[PDB]
């Protein structure tokens, strides 16, 4: 029976790995959003000039 216990543990390990990949993608997305904000500000200044 302890064999099957180990198998279920392995499945849980894979699931948490997937969650970690998700969170990394989210961090990259937020960096992109900040870059877009800076882009808009520079465009407005150029139009003024």
């Amino acid at each position: 029976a302890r064999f099957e216990q180990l198998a279920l543990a392995e499945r849980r390990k894979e699931e948490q790995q997937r969650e970690e990949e998700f969170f990394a993608q989210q961090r990259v997305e937020e960096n992109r959003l900040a870059n877009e904000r800076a882009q808009k500000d520079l465009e407005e200044d150029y139009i003024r000039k």
Partner: protein, 442 residues
């Protein structure tokens, strides 16, 4: 045969989820209350009766109430996976919390809710024919657990009288802390709990964290691990009622054997084969190894060292494949040891129990699967050290009346602090006096 469980507040409801998860998986009732069985003969299986009653349609329902003052946790129970198991009346919720104030639970708000609770307990007790106690799970650090737990235990104690009340209690840890006002609530709780409980089992979260770090291989434990461990302990203690065995032990035998004098009812709890699945194939698990394990201070679920005191009585519960001769040989070997000492007025220090059903393995659980286990509850004078540090922290806060205006404004006389602190001081003196060897007084 049957027992009814009362869960109060946040810790008590969350521990209840783990308990009923375990009891369902151990008996085999489906999450919707069903119980599949493919054989037409051999239905005569009354063991569920301790915790469930069946309807005329054959659905099973469990003998529990859930009590909380905030809605969120019980509404989480209402929407979860076990929605269909409980009758919706059993899940009781108030409007607003006791805000970590014992005074709000006891005086203002619990007096309104308490009569509904008593009506529910009556509704349970009417569907009974041999009730032999209540099991209560709570923490004394929070407001509703302290105030409503005391009020409810007082009312239960007047109405039902002699019937036994067994408490599993989470006390504020000696240096881990979650809220500032913990000492006041714990002192005031302990004052009520002294008069109105038959056995009280003490737990500290700091000990279960240490045990889960050292023995299990969990770097970042959370409350679900502790609650699953507590559920396993309760299942071990109640297994003696539910399955066949060589030496059975009824719940009244614990109180008769463990409690020498009527105030001395606080007991320590420990569990032996806490081991991981990878470790489990490296070790044999004989009777003597697990018997030696329950006595190591690394095994305790409360942060006290029993080497700083004297044992008065021990109750040893063995479950699984054990033979009585091995239990006797183990207990005699323990008795030989020099770091284990008994008070000279207690020559026959041990009670044994032996049950054939091995502990159940829970699909998400962290304990390994093992063929045998032993669980110990013991009464020892070392606990007096636990109260003294709480008393010092209370004295430190009360010397400047640091928060008292909330409690006095919500309705309590200032005198009640001094009364409770003097009564717990007398309990400390009782534990000092009981432990003095009679050969010294001649």
């Amino acid at each position: 045969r049957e027992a009814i469980c009362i869960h109060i507040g946040q810790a008590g409801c969350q521990v209840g989820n783990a308990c009923w998860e375990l009891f369902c998986l151990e008996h085999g009732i489906q999450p919707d209350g069903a119980m599949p069985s493919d054989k037409t003969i051999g239905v005569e299986d009354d063991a569920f009766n301790t915790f469930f009653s069946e309807t005329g349609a054959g659905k099973h329902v469990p003998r529990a109430v859930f009590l909380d003052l905030e809605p969120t946790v019980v509404d989480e129970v209402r929407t979860g996976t076990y929605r269909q198991l409980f009758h919706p009346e059993q899940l009781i919720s108030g409007k607003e919390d006791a805000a970590n104030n014992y005074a709000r639970g006891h005086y203002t708000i619990g007096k309104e809710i308490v009569d509904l609770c008593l009506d529910r307990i009556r509704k349970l007790a009417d569907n009974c024919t041999g009730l032999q106690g209540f099991l209560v799970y709570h923490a004394v650090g929070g407001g509703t657990g302290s105030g409503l737990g005391a009020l409810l235990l007082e009312r239960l104690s007047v109405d039902y009288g002699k019937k036994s009340k067994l408490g599993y209690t989470v006390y504020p840890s000696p240096q881990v802390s979650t809220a500032v006002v913990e000492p006041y609530n714990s002192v005031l709780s302990t004052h009520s709990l002294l008069e109105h409980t038959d056995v009280a089992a003490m737990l500290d979260n700091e000990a279960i964290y240490d045990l889960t770090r050292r023995n299990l291989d969990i770097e970042r434990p959370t409350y679900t691990n502790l609650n699953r461990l507590i559920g396993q302990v309760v299942s071990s203690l109640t297994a003696s009622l539910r399955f066949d065995g060589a030496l059975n032990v009824d719940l009244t035998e614990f109180q008769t054997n463990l409690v020498p004098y009527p105030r001395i009812h606080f007991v320590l709890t420990s569990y032996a084969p806490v081991i991981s699945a990878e470790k489990a194939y490296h070790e044999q698990l004989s009777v003597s190894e697990i018997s030696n394990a329950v006595f190591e201070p690394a095994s305790m679920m409360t942060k006290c060292d029993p080497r700083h005191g004297k044992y008065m009585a021990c109750c040893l519960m063995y479950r699984g494949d054990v033979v009585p001769k091995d239990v006797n040989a183990a207990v005699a070997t323990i008795k030989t040891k020099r770091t284990i000492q008994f008070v000279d007025w207690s020559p026959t220090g041990f009670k044994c129990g032996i049950n054939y059903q091995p502990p159940t393995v829970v699909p998400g659980g962290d304990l390994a699967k093992v063929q045998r286990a032993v669980c110990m509850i013991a009464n020892s004078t070392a606990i007096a050290e636990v109260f003294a540090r709480i008393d010092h922290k209370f004295d430190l806060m009360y010397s400047k009346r640091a928060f008292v205006h909330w409690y006095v404004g919500e309705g309590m006389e200032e005198g009640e602090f001094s009364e409770a602190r003097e009564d717990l001081a007398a309990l400390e003196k009782d534990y000092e006096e009981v432990g003095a060897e009679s050969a010294d007084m001649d």
